[PDB]
Amino acid sequence: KVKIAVDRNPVETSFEKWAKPGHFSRTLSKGPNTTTWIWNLHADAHDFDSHTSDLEEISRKVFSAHFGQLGIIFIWLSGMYFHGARFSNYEAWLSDPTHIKPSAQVVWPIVGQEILNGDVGGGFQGIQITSGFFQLWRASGITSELQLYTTAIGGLVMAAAMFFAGWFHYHKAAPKLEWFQNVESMLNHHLGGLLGLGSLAWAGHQIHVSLPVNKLLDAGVDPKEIPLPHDLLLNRAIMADLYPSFAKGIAPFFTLNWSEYSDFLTFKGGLNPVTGGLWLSDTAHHHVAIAVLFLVAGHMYRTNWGIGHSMKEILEAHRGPFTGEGHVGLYEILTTSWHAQLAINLALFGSLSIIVAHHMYAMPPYPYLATDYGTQLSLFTHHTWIGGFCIVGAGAHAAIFMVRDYDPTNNYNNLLDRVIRHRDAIISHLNWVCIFLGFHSFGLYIHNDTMSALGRPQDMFSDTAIQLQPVFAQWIQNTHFLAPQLTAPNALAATSLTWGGDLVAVGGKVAMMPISLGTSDFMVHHIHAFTIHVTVLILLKGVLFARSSRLIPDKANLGFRFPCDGPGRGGTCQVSAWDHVFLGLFWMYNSLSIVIFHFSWKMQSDVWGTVTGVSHITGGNFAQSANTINGWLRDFLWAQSSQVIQSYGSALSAYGLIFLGAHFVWAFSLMFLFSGRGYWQELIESIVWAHNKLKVAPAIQPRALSITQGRAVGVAHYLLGGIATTWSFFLARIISVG
Amino acid sequence: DIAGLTPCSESKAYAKLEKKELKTLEKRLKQYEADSAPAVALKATMERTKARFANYAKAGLLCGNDGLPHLIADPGLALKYGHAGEVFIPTFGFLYVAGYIGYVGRQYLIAVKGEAKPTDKEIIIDVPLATKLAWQGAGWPLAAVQELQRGTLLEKEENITVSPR
Amino acid sequence: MKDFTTYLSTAPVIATIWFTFTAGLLIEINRYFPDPLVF
Amino acid sequence: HKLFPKFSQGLAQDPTTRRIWYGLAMAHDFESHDGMTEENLYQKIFASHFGQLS
Amino acid sequence: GMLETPVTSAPIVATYLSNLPAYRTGVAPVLRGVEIGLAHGFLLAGPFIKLGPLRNVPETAEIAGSLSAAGLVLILALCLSIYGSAQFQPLFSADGWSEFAAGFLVGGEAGVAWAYVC
Amino acid sequence: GPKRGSLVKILRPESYWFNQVGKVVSVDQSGVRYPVVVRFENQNYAGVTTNNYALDEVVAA
Amino acid sequence: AHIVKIYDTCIGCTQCVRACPLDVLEMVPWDGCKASQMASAPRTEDCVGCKRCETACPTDFLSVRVYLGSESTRSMGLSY
Amino acid sequence: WTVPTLNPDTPSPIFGGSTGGLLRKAQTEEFYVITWEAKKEQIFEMPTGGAAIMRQGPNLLKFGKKEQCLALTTQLRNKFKLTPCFYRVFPDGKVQYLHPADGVYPEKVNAGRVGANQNMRRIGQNVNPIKVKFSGRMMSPAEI
Ligand code: CLA
Numbered sequence A: 001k002v003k004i005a006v007d008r009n010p011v012e013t014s015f016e017k018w019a020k021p022g023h024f025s026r027t028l029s030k031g032p033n034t035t036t037w038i039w040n041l042h043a044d045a046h047d048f049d050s051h052t053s054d055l056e057e058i059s060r061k062v063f064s065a066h067f068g069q070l071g072i073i074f075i076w077l078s079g080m081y082f083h084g085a086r087f088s089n090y091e092a093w094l095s096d097p098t099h100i101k102p103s104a105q106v107v108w109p110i111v112g113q114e115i116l117n118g119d120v121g122g123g124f125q126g127i128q129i130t131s132g133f134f135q136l137w138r139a140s141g142i143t144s145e146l147q148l149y150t151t152a153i154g155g156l157v158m159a160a161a162m163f164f165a166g167w168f169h170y171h172k173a174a175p176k177l178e179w180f181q182n183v184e185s186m187l188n189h190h191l192g193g194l195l196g197l198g199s200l201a202w203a204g205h206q207i208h209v210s211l212p213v214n215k216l217l218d219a220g221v222d223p224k225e226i227p228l229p230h231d232l233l234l235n236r237a238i239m240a241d242l243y244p245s246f247a248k249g250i251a252p253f254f255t256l257n258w259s260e261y262s263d264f265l266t267f268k269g270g271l272n273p274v275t276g277g278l279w280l281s282d283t284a285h286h287h288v289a290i291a292v293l294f295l296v297a298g299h300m301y302r303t304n305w306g307i308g309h310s311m312k313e314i315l316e317a318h319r320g321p322f323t324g325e326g327h328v329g330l331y332e333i334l335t336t337s338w339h340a341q342l343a344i345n346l347a348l349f350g351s352l353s354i355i356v357a358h359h360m361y362a363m364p365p366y367p368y369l370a371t372d373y374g375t376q377l378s379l380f381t382h383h384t385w386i387g388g389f390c391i392v393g394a395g396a397h398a399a400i401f402m403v404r405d406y407d408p409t410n411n412y413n414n415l416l417d418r419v420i421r422h423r424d425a426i427i428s429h430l431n432w433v434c435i436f437l438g439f440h441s442f443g444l445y446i447h448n449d450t451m452s453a454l455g456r457p458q459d460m461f462s463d464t465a466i467q468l469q470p471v472f473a474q475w476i477q478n479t480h481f482l483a484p485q486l487t488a489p490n491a492l493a494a495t496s497l498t499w500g501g502d503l504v505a506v507g508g509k510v511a512m513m514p515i516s517l518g519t520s521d522f523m524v525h526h527i528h529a530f531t532i533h534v535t536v537l538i539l540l541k542g543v544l545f546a547r548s549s550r551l552i553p554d555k556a557n558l559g560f561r562f563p564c565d566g567p568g569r570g571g572t573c574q575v576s577a578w579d580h581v582f583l584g585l586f587w588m589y590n591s592l593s594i595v596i597f598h599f600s601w602k603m604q605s606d607v608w609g610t611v612t613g614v615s616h617i618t619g620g621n622f623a624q625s626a627n628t629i630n631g632w633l634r635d636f637l638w639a640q641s642s643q644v645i646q647s648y649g650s651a652l653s654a655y656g657l658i659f660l661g662a663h664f665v666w667a668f669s670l671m672f673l674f675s676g677r678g679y680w681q682e683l684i685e686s687i688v689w690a691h692n693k694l695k696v697a698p699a700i701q702p703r704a705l706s707i708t709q710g711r712a713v714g715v716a717h718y719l720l721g722g723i724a725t726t727w728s729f730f731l732a733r734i735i736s737v738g
Numbered sequence B: 001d002i003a004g005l006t007p008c009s010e011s012k013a014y015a016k017l018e019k020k021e022l023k024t025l026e027k028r029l030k031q032y033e034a035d036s037a038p039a040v041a042l043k044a045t046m047e048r049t050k051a052r053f054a055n056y057a058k059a060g061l062l063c064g065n066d067g068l069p070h071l072i073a074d075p076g077l078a079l080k081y082g083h084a085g086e087v088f089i090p091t092f093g094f095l096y097v098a099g100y101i102g103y104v105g106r107q108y109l110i111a112v113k114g115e116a117k118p119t120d121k122e123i124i125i126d127v128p129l130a131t132k133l134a135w136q137g138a139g140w141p142l143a144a145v146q147e148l149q150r151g152t153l154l155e156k157e158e159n160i161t162v163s164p165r
Numbered sequence C: 001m002k003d004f005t006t007y008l009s010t011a012p013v014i015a016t017i018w019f020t021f022t023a024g025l026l027i028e029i030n031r032y033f034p035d036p037l038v039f
Numbered sequence D: 001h002k003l004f005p006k007f008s009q010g011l012a013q014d015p016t017t018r019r020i021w022y023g024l025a026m027a028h029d030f031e032s033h034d035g036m037t038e039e040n041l042y043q044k045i046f047a048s049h050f051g052q053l054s
Numbered sequence E: 001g002m003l004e005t006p007v008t009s010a011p012i013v014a015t016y017l018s019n020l021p022a023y024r025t026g027v028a029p030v031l032r033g034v035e036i037g038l039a040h041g042f043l044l045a046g047p048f049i050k051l052g053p054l055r056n057v058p059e060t061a062e063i064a065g066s067l068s069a070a071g072l073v074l075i076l077a078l079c080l081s082i083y084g085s086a087q088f089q090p091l092f093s094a095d096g097w098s099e100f101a102a103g104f105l106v107g108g109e110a111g112v113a114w115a116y117v118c
Numbered sequence F: 001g002p003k004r005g006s007l008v009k010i011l012r013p014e015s016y017w018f019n020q021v022g023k024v025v026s027v028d029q030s031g032v033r034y035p036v037v038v039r040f041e042n043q044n045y046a047g048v049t050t051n052n053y054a055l056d057e058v059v060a061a
Numbered sequence G: 001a002h003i004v005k006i007y008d009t010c011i012g013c014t015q016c017v018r019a020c021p022l023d024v025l026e027m028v029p030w031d032g033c034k035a036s037q038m039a040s041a042p043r044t045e046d047c048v049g050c051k052r053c054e055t056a057c058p059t060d061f062l063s064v065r066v067y068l069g070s071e072s073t074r075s076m077g078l079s080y
Numbered sequence H: 001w002t003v004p005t006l007n008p009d010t011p012s013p014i015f016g017g018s019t020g021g022l023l024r025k026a027q028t029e030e031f032y033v034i035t036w037e038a039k040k041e042q043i044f045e046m047p048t049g050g051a052a053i054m055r056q057g058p059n060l061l062k063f064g065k066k067e068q069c070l071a072l073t074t075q076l077r078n079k080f081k082l083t084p085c086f087y088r089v090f091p092d093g094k095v096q097y098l099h100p101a102d103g104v105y106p107e108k109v110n111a112g113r114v115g116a117n118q119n120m121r122r123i124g125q126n127v128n129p130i131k132v133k134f135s136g137r138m139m140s141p142a143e144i
């Protein structure tokens, strides 16, 4: 029986526990004796497993926490809309998108920082934004600042509702454990109601507001002169003036004569040629199809009536001869362990974000987006980074499950058990394939460097010497370009210009052209494969050996996060799964930095540029230069950092400052990464003596950071430094040459 | 003058840099309307630029061969040639405020060590006692030299040391 | 209310209030007295 | 066990690859070899300084 | 125990591994060496010819490829000899491994010489 | 030796609380080598606030 | 083999014994402390030098000390 | 109490076979063999990875190092309240009993034990490294 189950008034709303730091932990509620306490207080603040053993209380805590997160995000969205309405040039940009730079941040005139308010056009001065909100707002049909202001107030109201919902569902009416364990009902409601009704209501908004307003905006009529959306809902005769299908109403829908809705539910493909974005009619049909699909999908699992599937029965039904008991026991694991769920959801959520990056660069969904090169670079890079971080998190929480929640006396000869039982074979094969990939992928680059340096270019791996053509990718590309003719008859064009074909340009700039693939693309793709495989190796090794290894047979009893097991047995530093997350973080940074460099150079070289033929931003140097390390060093890094290094005295000077600052923070991380806390503790001893001499020794004893906190501080400053460096480089480059 | 440096009111590269910055600001200015907000902001920027160059030439700063103000850090040379307001008066101003902060922190520590929970007062600040010591710390150099002369500024050799001392 | 002022007496809250006061005092000084290099 | 390194039988009884690296890294630290006296120390230092000269 | 697997414990795989010359248990180490050398030198003659630095100069690509292959076979035979000198202090003995390394040298040079004719 | 509750001073040089002040808990009257039990208000690097000392390692100061 | 020593500041709390992952230490009769128990290290040939014993000891300073000496196959923790 | 003997015909726990098992150290140097008597049939965690059902009665497992046998001993002793003992086996067939070599577990005092490696002094009363220079080897000053 699926029903609402709630306990009344569990936790009194009181300011008492605000005044007692570390109340949540029996160890930390004793008070601070040394400085380590503070760090512990913040590190274990949200580790609810270390607070209680009771799954119900933990579940309630995570529920209200999620509400807090949603309220924060709503505050953030409210801020973006309010700043877009009050401190922007959005209307001016609407009147001239091709020659006005999107700006929605202005600085105050103090200490000379006023110079950052640059000439972005439209009679405005501010910081040019690259988040892409302007294109999203134009695509949604927003025309005035008033509507943005109203959206800001609405989002603030929703933030207040989310914080009230958090307080309410923790302190007043907090759900019971068997409410949270209704996973079949949760999937039904989220697949129907969330994704399904979400895309249904959005398709409603599109068909009724987006399509007419953007059709008029593409027609050329002044935005203020375009009818307001409520007049588009109210008087259907205007909707019939743009698309005569609307004259017949919803009569073709119920009578199944859906073909008459082909005015606004299309299958054109390609891009809008005057606008450089996907057709909103294609997007409307897409969201209608997505809606119907998800609402069908949301009626799959049995709840309070006989019909519907059961998750444990589907899992226990798939058993073979090679795997033994198969998927038995997995339902119990995924309905009692939050960390397993978090690992799965983080992996797929990160992967999904990377897919979002690729599909949004390749098939520009917003108008005047493809030619806002800064926005495209920013969006791709951003969502790729977010993706990578969520994948590393997935590996982390997988390992946390493996140490804290794994219990083999309910999990005995299972898929998980066999994985743990042949982990040596898995890791050794992954090891070998990583070394193989490293040798041949990186070795081609080193080979080319040597041959080019020795004056023998005919012996290189290139398009003119020893060729290594991406035959398979070229074949898939050609097939997808020829797809509208035979295997997709109702498609007018291909799904993306990059497959092949003509060229769509807007305002003299290239929106998208066919992307060619040669030896350089072969080499970078195998570099990507190598780095990804190594990252998977580290993380997977971390999760498979989290409990035990031949080195530490009882590693599980030492916890998930611990520094080592002493200098014996040769040395056991970084044996914990946490340390494997730490190394996977560095390798994830490596991989995604090479990925975004690939994207940046390739787009600036073979795609972007002006139309007179097409003059590219870097003239097409990718195909001959991206085969040597010196080529990346000179033609990419050195050449394209001109803009960042000479940005002083202009509006881009902040990117130079953050270039230097990011380099500094990156180097600053090396002190934590390369050293150890014994030295620092002894140094602190001397300093403590000096403070004792002058009666200024604190009652809370100064302690050097822990080993694991030294590693954490190290990797955090390392990531912040490197990522912010590439951020400043990218933004200054693409804003100046864009 | 000092070290072969010309005064900034006499330096030519100083006036050249002033004219160059005004030229950059008016090249940014000449692409707007007359009474618009970017025009008002850039005219306020030009006003502050002219006022800043007039104030630096007024104060008797020394410029080099590039037209930039140079500072003199020697007490007697700066007191002799009238450059005491750039290092000497700033260094005694800094020593006043830095010793203020240090003396207020030291008095807070000695005030909270004499209780049953010194660490609990270190985490959660006694705000009235902190404000009382913050207002009383204006006579910190007098109280500092008095604690120096009584021998109560220093702890004796009851300090913590290592076995080879 | 006693516990709310005890929470406001904690270290990061007072550090936030005090650095907001100090930074705002420096910002108002650099506004009304633009660009001081000497004296 | 093995011969190398001939100055340390604690390293010579090492069954691992640690023996090679620690025989390389401890070859010229004569004060902590097996059976090293003080006259032997000064004599090997004097001959080693001749080797550097050559 | 050891993990039971249809790759590690297949019958036809076990017979195929028993038929290869590293496992026949009763043939001479010289015969094992010459068979392993005739396999490996013949396969190693290839990429030095097709991809080496003289691959595009006619009439000399196969000569330099086979000559570099013979040099590599000599290096491999020296490696076998020092491995046997360090390891043992019929195939797993000092005399047997020295006969095996000499047989590998002879068979590898013969395989390279037969690949030059082919 | 010293009495319960009295303040003593530690002269063991390889101790964390050398040249510092603690409080006597108990003195064992057997033939134990280190009978003086002294608690300290601050903890060492191992998180311990109690150590045993000899008679010539404590001075009631 | 590593060098493990026990010093007379031991109070026979048995913490070091229950911390060793290799069973090297044991408690013997003694008369030097109130607990009438002292640690002893009769099997230092199996000691790897992990120093869990030193972590478990409450005394200041340590009453058990591990001096990393010459490595063997047992002290390196090798299963191969 | 007398020293027990190894029965090689003791039934092993129910286990499908891991990759973390024995290696050539078991054939060339030594391998260690653990034995306990169980009260009921119950799943435990193998220290080399995976789950295993123990049999009711005697059980027998062989590991590669001593720490694996201590980890299984600690698991079977703290979680299941059992009394195991693990031996040392050489490829000749030589059997060396240990843990508990006294018969009583070392975490409690027993008469008859002789204290080894006990310095009867403090740690601050060690000599300086100048006093032990030019011996036959490296010496820490705590060796004397
Ligand atoms: C406004 C009235 C109010 C009051 C008096 C309380 C009081 C309490 N809550 Mg409740 N609760 C409330 C509203 C309130 N809550 C709201 C709005 C939510 C949804 C978030 C919750 C959800 C909730 C959960 C899940 C839990 C509590 C718990 C508690 C108890 C202890 C927590 C504590 O003392 O740390 C006080 C914490 C803070 C003062 C820090 C707030 C952190 C904010 C939310 C994060 C956002 C800051 C933001 C990111 C800015 C950062 C900028 C930059 C520097 C990064 C205490 C009785 C806990 C408990 O009962 O344990 C036994 C517990 O687990 N509350």
Ligand code: CLA
Binding pocket: A075, A076, A077, A078, A079, A080, A082, A083, A087, A105, A106, A107, A108, C013, C016, C017, C020
């Ligand atoms: C959520 C993200 C977000 C971010 C990053 C920004 C960022 C900015 N805003 Mg925007 N804004 C936002 C959301 C955001 N805003 C929202 C949701 C609204 C509607 C309420 C606004 C309405 C708004 C206006 C009207 C203005 C800005 C302005 C600014 C700029 C300067 C801010 C400043 O100096 O304030 C002043 C600094 C302070 C008030 C510091 C005091 C902090 C206190 C002391 C902390 C005390 C700690 C306490 C426990 C926690 C806070 C509790 C809270 C209830 C007070 C800065 C770019 C200004 C601007 O753009 O100028 C051109 C401006 O005029 N914002």
Ligand code: CLA
Binding pocket: A062, A063, A066, A067, A070, A179, A180, A182, A183, A185, A186, A189, A190, A192, A193, A194
């Ligand atoms: C069809 C109804 C429905 C909808 C739309 C949702 C939607 C959501 N649930 Mg789910 N939930 C449902 C039924 C539903 N739930 C049922 C029946 C159960 C019990 C089996 C759960 C148990 C559950 C748990 C344990 C959690 C969620 C969470 C979430 C949020 C995921 C965050 C996100 O990406 O959304 C995008 C964000 C939005 C779309 C914002 C709009 C949200 C508003 C409130 C509309 C959603 C409708 C809402 C359910 C109606 C509430 C009415 C209320 C006044 C009584 C999302 C808002 C997670 C969460 O974040 O909690 C805070 C979470 O931890 N749900």
Ligand code: CLA
Binding pocket: A200, A201, A202, A203, A204, A205, A207, A208, A232, A233, A234, A235, A236, A239, A245, A246, A247, A248, A249, A250, A253, A261, A288
């Ligand atoms: C999912 C979101 C969504 C929403 C909200 C709408 C809404 C609408 N569509 Mg649209 N439509 C959609 C998706 C959506 N559509 C999609 C996906 C397609 C493609 C197939 C279309 C294709 C389409 C066409 C071709 C047309 C519409 C039309 C309409 C309008 C009239 C429909 C109607 O008569 O419904 C039936 C009436 C109701 C459902 C009434 C609602 C119930 C009321 C509010 C209850 C009130 C009860 C309460 C007690 C009384 C108030 C008391 C209070 C004052 C105190 C309406 C604004 C028509 C139009 O006007 O176009 C401009 C039209 O011609 N739609």
Ligand code: CLA
Binding pocket: A431, A432, A434, A435, A436, A437, A438, A439, A442, A443, A446, A534, A537, A538, A583, A584, A586, A587
């Ligand atoms: C650029 C510096 C650098 C290099 C060369 C390496 C190299 C490697 N890392 Mg390391 N890593 C690095 C930075 C680097 N890392 C940093 C900064 C960290 C700290 C975050 C790490 C942390 C780390 C982790 C956690 C892991 C690695 C692993 C590896 C190995 C991957 C396997 C492989 O591809 O083999 C191929 C070898 C190469 C690509 C090296 C260059 C080979 C050249 C080009 C050809 C060799 C022929 C040579 C020229 C002949 C010389 C002859 C001469 C001696 C006479 C590889 C040796 C992984 C591993 O070992 O698992 C498989 C692994 O898991 N590293």
Ligand code: CLA
Binding pocket: B074, B075, B076, B077, B080
């Ligand atoms: C940090 C170290 C330092 C150094 C390297 C200098 C360097 C100098 N001092 Mg300065 N000064 C300093 C700190 C320093 N000062 C401090 C802390 C005070 C406050 C006590 C002064 C107060 C002071 C006065 C009143 C005068 C100088 C002068 C000078 C210049 C020549 C001095 C000389 O020839 O004697 C050798 C240098 C030293 C012994 C170093 C210590 C300087 C002492 C404190 C003063 C020496 C003054 C000198 C005897 C008078 C020379 C008269 C001149 C006309 C020849 C020389 C550039 C003189 C000047 O203006 O020349 C143009 C001068 O009249 N200084």
Ligand code: CLA
Binding pocket: D024, D025, D026, D027, D028, D029, D030
């Ligand atoms: C002036 C003459 C001199 C003499 C006679 C000595 C003698 C000694 N030193 Mg001292 N020392 C010296 C100068 C000297 N040192 C200098 C210049 C440095 C700074 C580098 C040091 C820093 C130093 C340290 C930190 C230590 C010693 C130690 C020692 C003792 C043992 C050395 C040993 O066995 O290691 C054998 C040496 C090696 C195996 C060297 C390995 C190779 C090194 C890392 C350089 C690798 C770079 C490589 C060659 C580059 C190739 C590039 C490629 C592309 C071509 C011996 C008493 C050790 C000691 O006393 O222990 C208690 C010890 O720990 N020395």
Ligand code: CLA
Binding pocket: A439, A440, A441, A442, A443, A444, A446, A447, A450, A459, A460, A466, E047, E048, E051, E052, E053, E054
């Ligand atoms: C690792 C990547 C890599 C690759 C693929 C190459 C490839 C090449 N190099 Mg380059 N080289 C490299 C790295 C690499 N190099 C690096 C890092 C350096 C600097 C140290 C150089 C410096 C260099 C120089 C100076 C020269 C070359 C040359 C060459 C060419 C011929 C080499 C040769 O004849 O070897 C012989 C080839 C083999 C022995 C092949 C062995 C590998 C086999 C195929 C593996 C088989 C596995 C099989 C599938 C398993 C089946 C199992 C089953 C039977 C059971 C060839 C194109 C030569 C040239 O002229 O360039 C055109 C040349 O003069 N290289």
